[PDB]
Scaffold this active site. Structure first.
Site, PDB file in Angstrom:
ATOM      1  N   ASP A  75      15.124  33.026  29.680  1.00 40.58           N
ATOM      2  CA  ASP A  75      16.164  32.031  29.413  1.00 40.58           C
ATOM      3  C   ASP A  75      17.026  31.788  30.651  1.00 40.58           C
ATOM      4  O   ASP A  75      17.948  30.975  30.626  1.00 40.58           O
ATOM      5  CB  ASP A  75      17.039  32.439  28.215  1.00 40.58           C
ATOM      6  N   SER A 120      18.971  33.903  32.196  1.00 44.22           N
ATOM      7  CA  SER A 120      19.962  34.944  32.386  1.00 44.22           C
ATOM      8  C   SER A 120      19.295  36.103  33.141  1.00 44.22           C
ATOM      9  O   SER A 120      18.075  36.136  33.256  1.00 44.22           O
ATOM     10  CB  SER A 120      20.531  35.387  31.040  1.00 44.22           C
ATOM     11  N   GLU A 168      15.484  51.424  30.879  1.00 43.75           N
ATOM     12  CA  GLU A 168      16.003  50.126  31.240  1.00 43.75           C
ATOM     13  C   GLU A 168      15.896  49.904  32.739  1.00 43.75           C
ATOM     14  O   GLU A 168      15.555  48.818  33.174  1.00 43.75           O
ATOM     15  CB  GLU A 168      17.462  49.965  30.792  1.00 43.75           C
ATOM     16  N   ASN A 203      15.529  37.047  32.840  1.00 42.06           N
ATOM     17  CA  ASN A 203      14.981  36.711  31.540  1.00 42.06           C
ATOM     18  C   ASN A 203      14.473  35.296  31.545  1.00 42.06           C
ATOM     19  O   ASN A 203      14.966  34.431  32.278  1.00 42.06           O
ATOM     20  CB  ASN A 203      16.020  36.893  30.438  1.00 42.06           C
ATOM     21  N   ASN A 240      23.299  42.123  30.346  1.00 42.86           N
ATOM     22  CA  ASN A 240      22.773  40.776  30.385  1.00 42.86           C
ATOM     23  C   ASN A 240      23.849  39.725  30.737  1.00 42.86           C
ATOM     24  O   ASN A 240      24.934  39.707  30.158  1.00 42.86           O
ATOM     25  CB  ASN A 240      22.121  40.478  29.034  1.00 42.86           C
ATOM     26  N   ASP A 259      19.444  40.525  33.852  1.00 40.62           N
ATOM     27  CA  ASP A 259      19.944  41.835  33.436  1.00 40.62           C
ATOM     28  C   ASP A 259      20.335  42.631  34.674  1.00 40.62           C
ATOM     29  O   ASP A 259      19.620  42.608  35.666  1.00 40.62           O
ATOM     30  CB  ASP A 259      18.886  42.574  32.612  1.00 40.62           C
TER      31      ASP A 259
END
Length: 129
Positions: free
Chosen positions: A48, A50, A35, A46, A59, A52
């Site tokens: 969208d 958002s 990750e 992301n 998130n 991380d």
């Protein structure tokens, strides 16, 4: 901070992640490696909008507040920036709620695709736990 494999292994276990909800410690270490590369300061955006955050790429759409993910939740009740600290406590406590939310570790795409089903014990091998 960038963690050592065994070093992160030790902080994770210290923080109660070993066998949390049935997931042995190597699962957690494997998820962190893919990750974030063990980097507490990892951020990723992301599509969208958002973002991380941190060692476990938590998130902002559901779990933390970053003030720029319109109509998102802060279910871990923390600033997303707290997930970037050299102390993993925030990241761990929030991770604890995520893995309990019903889909277990499958919430971490890199875990599902890169750790799930593999010999994750290999991740804590040689570590003084």
């Amino acid at each position: 901070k960038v963690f050592g494999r065994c070093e992160l292994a030790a902080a994770m276990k210290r923080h109660g992640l070993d066998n949390y909800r049935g997931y042995s410690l190597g699962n957690w270490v494997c998820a962190a490696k893919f990750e974030s590369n063990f980097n507490t300061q990892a951020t990723n955006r992301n599509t969208d909008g958002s973002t991380d955050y941190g060692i476990l790429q938590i998130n902002s759409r559901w779990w933390c507040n970053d003030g720029r993910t319109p109509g998102s939740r802060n279910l871990c009740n923390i600033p997303c920036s707290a997930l970037l600290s050299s102390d993993i406590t925030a990241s761990v406590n929030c991770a604890k709620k995520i893995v309990s939310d019903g889909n277990g570790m499958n919430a971490w795409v890199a875990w599902r695709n890169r750790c799930k089903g593999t010999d994750v014990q290999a991740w804590i091998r040689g570590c003084r736990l």
